[PDB]
Design a protein around this ligand. Sequence first.
Ligand code: HEM
Ligand SMILES: CC[C@]1(C)C[C@@H](OC(=O)CSc2n[nH]c(N)n2)[C@]2(C)[C@H](C)CC[C@]3(CCC(=O)[C@H]32)[C@@H](C)[C@@H]1O
Ligand SMILES: CC[C@]1(C)C[C@@H](OC(=O)CSc2n[nH]c(N)n2)[C@]2(C)[C@H](C)CC[C@]3(CCC(=O)[C@H]32)[C@@H](C)[C@@H]1O
Length: 465
Amino acid sequence: ALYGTRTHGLFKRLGIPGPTPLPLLGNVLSYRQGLWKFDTECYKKYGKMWGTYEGQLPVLAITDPDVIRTVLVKECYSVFTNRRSLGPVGFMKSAISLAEDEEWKRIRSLLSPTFTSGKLKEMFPIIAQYGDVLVRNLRREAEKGKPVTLKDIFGAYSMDVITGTSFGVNIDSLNNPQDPFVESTKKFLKFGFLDPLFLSIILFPFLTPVFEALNVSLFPKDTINFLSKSVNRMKKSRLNDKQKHRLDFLQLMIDSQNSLSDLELAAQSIIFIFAGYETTSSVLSFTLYELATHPDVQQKLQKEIDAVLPNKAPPTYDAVVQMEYLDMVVNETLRLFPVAIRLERTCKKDVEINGVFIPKGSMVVIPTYALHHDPKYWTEPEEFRPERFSKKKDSIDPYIYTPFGTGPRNCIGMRFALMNMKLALIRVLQNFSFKPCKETQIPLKLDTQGLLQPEKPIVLKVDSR
Ligand code: HEM
Ligand SMILES: CC[C@]1(C)C[C@@H](OC(=O)CSc2n[nH]c(N)n2)[C@]2(C)[C@H](C)CC[C@]3(CCC(=O)[C@H]32)[C@@H](C)[C@@H]1O
Ligand SMILES: CC[C@]1(C)C[C@@H](OC(=O)CSc2n[nH]c(N)n2)[C@]2(C)[C@H](C)CC[C@]3(CCC(=O)[C@H]32)[C@@H](C)[C@@H]1O
């Protein structure tokens, strides 16, 4: 009867193991140690499948590849079409990721042409120009002999490529410390699942219509207002530029208007900036950390770069995407550090998952981090071994290794993100070597809040070649 406990007997009734939930809270306060940690410990303790509660919301975690393939691929359109229902977001409900069902299919179908093979190849010289700025700014920090905080300069690179390619504007995050775009992303859900507003929605989902009527949002009003005005400024500039320009992300949405509302257009732009910034920055920083602590891998990778691009030859799109050892290094980094930590799907109706009848509205979790570190699938899972992804080896199971997800709801900017990071890695490894200093944290400790990120900022010594 009590509102805090109505569903907390479900998994016990179904014979599904899991940690005993607390009234009102469920198991959500166990997230405070980091979702990567909670999922791993539930996996090791309960096995192939376990259940938890976010407030009263039942959460079923699955690790079997075939069950994962059923949820993410086979029954996506019919059952598992959307992820969680976030809460009060305002107009950001129309963002491609947060849109649901047929509205999501339409928006994704409209935006997907942004990342065709031709469009990725077309925008590659824009990314290469920022790569030149990256090497030069990095040499400036290197030649003082002092260690380099990677997220400063690679965050600026990550924000520059997503801004220059999508909106056709060079905001020059790399050369303008105090970048309003970078700082606007910082306020969003700092405390993660310990965020008071987000936690109140988890405990009391019926508060969402109340907060929507009050224009309260999980997104910071300041961030939303700055990015919307920025998008609208670049938009008006594009309509007045009596000159040539790419058919880019911004133009694609402008074309949809002249035949997508002003708010919907802002929502897509805001999501692309959020999804593209911290992800690309973190993975680049994780990769260089692993290369600095594995100098044999760093040397071998530099040898492939010099063989394919002799005499510091500028990379081409084809060169970037076809360097085998570079691909394995990036894949192995994403195995160790899948920054989204897990995949989530909502049951839009009752469904039987692996002989288990799960009610409508429940959440299914694919614990990407736990599966990436599972010794059942990877020998010595904590070790950084790019040779795991050798083309000569057996094919990697696409439902165990899910750093970008799988199925119709997977990462739409996967190839774009892989091109950005590989371009940056080639250019800096053509010019520099990376090694740890006294200020480097070895081994790397993970934060407990939000995205998979280091507890302390990664700092490395950078020497010229
Ligand atoms: C290394 C960098 C990146 C990682 C690890 C990453 C990871 C992910 C993951 C795990 C998902 C969820 C897929 C699923 O639920 O099955 C996702 C979705 C998404 N990503 Fe990425 N991503 C990255 C870069 C980017 C970039 C650069 C963009 C923008 C250009 C982007 C835009 C999106 C969008 C829009 C979605 C939602 C797709 C949808 O719901 O239809 N991501 N990403
Ligand atoms: C803001 C975009 C959303 C809502 C959160 C994302 O996360 C971010 O984009 C960065 S979170 C952040 N950046 N800065 C601060 N302070 N927090 C996640 C977690 C991920 C990294 C990229 C993909 C996806 C979908 C599935 C996910 O796993 C999320 C997007 C598309 C989401 O729709
Ligand atoms: C799926 C990723 C996780 C597990 C949930 C996220 O939530 C999403 O990413 C929602 S994306 C979506 N919801 N509905 C649809 N259609 N797409 C949260 C809540 C957030 C928005 C983005 C950051 C973070 C960490 C701290 C949080 O607070 C969560 C990620 C990194 C989590 O690891």
